[model samples]
Target: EVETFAFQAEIAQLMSLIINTFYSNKEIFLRELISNSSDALDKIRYESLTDPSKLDSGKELHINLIPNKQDRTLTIVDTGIGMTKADLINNLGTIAKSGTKAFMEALQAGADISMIGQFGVGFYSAYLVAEKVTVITKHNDDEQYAWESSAGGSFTVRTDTGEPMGRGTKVILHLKEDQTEYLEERRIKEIVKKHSQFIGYPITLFVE
Candidate 1:
């Protein structure tokens, strides 16, 4: 069954600000994403150590970047702890803490915007570049599912019959106008090196 939810007012406003004003350096979008991937991988790895069965039998933990010029999609896949449908709603459906006005106040005061993570709104930052963001993921305890949104206030989540991610998440970013530079192999590698080289998991970029 498919489910839809309107983002909390705070989250909707937060996304609007991010899509329009939160980002000054677009390159950091990749950094923030890669950082998020690293964190996800860390979660599964730590949990697996305590319970060996937590790891996927056939897949090792890694991050893969696949660029599709024809479709203009940048897919970041990671073998890590994926989210359940409830998690999707809880994580993206609500802004637990009020940060939108606080962020705007800080930005207007000329505070550095590089610490976007400080606001716990890193995921929505993708909207700064993606026309639409689709998250297809699978958690060990939950069935495979997909969530998609244009960051326009409401998103839909439903069971996905497509190929399962094995045991992780696949975030596909539909690049926006003038954002196709992110599809370049060199640009992706450069961004990773600058901001994500020390990340715990190996990040591979696929070029064809």
Candidate 2:
């Protein structure tokens, strides 16, 4: 039997409710991203243990934080297994995989995970506070690439304009009018500590 494909109508106004008002703990976004990075790093490390050659590049599992006070922007970078174009769309486009409906059911089922960004939708959470988000990434097999998006549905991907960053990924968040506080060192540190203190990887900030 052949299966037919169907599409949902353009996203709803309730999406704003989900984006802005659904999550009570708004600051949990950072923790979710870092946790995801930690998972990627862990997967690669585990693979490297058996396949020594796999560690030839992007061996370190860590997180990097960059802040530009003048622009009120914050970039969170991770050294881990990076994503390709398809990976980005599926992950960021709300395609359901192992989680999705289940995670939602769990949340509605009253499961408390201060971490809300565990699903494909979570990566977009950065837009909840940013005017624009830029992604610089290199996959294990593909050349480094860049992805840019505002809070809207579409995103653009292109080859990395800058130097080839050995491997892994970097996410830049151009903070919104109301999120300038996220650019502060103390506040950023607090957010990291609150959500990622126990993550099994190195997380550091680039200080001015």
Candidate 3:
């Protein structure tokens, strides 16, 4: 089943502002995304302390950066606590309503700010370079789901019947023509090293 929801009014406005004014430091998008993946990984690991089954057997915790030149897409995959359909809508669709509006106001005021972890809006930074974004995730408690958005008024969430993701989240960024730099392995490595080097888990860049 597929369902669509409009971005909360404040979220819609925040996205527009991010895509337009946030271009100057677009590379931070990678940083923001990697940070999010790390957080998810941390959650799953912490949860496993009490319920060992939460940690999938034989699946090592890590992050993978897959760059596909043919598709002009960069996929970031993490062995972490994946989201359910409701999580997709609430976390991605609505966000922190007042926080988003405040973020916009701060940007307009030229106030130096960072809301990545605080507002949980770092995921939206994908729009800085991506024309469209797709998230495929599977959680232990729920069936796999895919969420897609084009930074437009609405986004869609549906059951994903494609390849099984096991237990994790995969974020595929469809890079804009002018933002193809993100589709390069070397660039991804640089960004990861510069920003997420201290992250707990191993981050691997797949190369053919």
Report the number of the highest-TM-score candidate.
Answer: 3
User: Tens-digit lDDT track for model 2 on 1-208?
Assistant: 2111222223222134345555455576677667667766776787788897776775667899888988778888887878876666554334544444555667687854453455454665665677788888877777777877664455567777697777787888888787787778898899888777888787898886
Where's the lowest-lDDT run of ten residues in candidate 2?
1-10
Q: lDDT for each of the candidates?
A: 0.80, 0.68, 0.82
lDDT string for model 3 (165-188, tens) is 889899999999999988777888
RMSD to the native, candidate 2? 5.3
The Cα RMSD of model 1 versus the native structure comes to: 2.1
- Best-performing candidate as measured by lDDT: 3
Mind giving the per-residue lDDT tens digits that candidate 1 earns over 1-208? Answer: 7788898887787678767774558778777777777777888888988898888533598999999989999999988888877888886422434555566667778865566666666777787679999999888888889999997789899999998667888889999978999999998889888988898788889996
Assess every candidate by TM-score: 0.91, 0.81, 0.92
Alpha-carbon RMSD, each predicted model? 2.1, 5.3, 2.0
Q: List the residue pairs that clash in candidate 2.
A: none
- Better model by TM-score, 2 or 3? 3
- In model 3, pairs of residues that clash are none
Any runs in candidate 1 off by more than 4 Å, and if so which?
57-59, 92-109
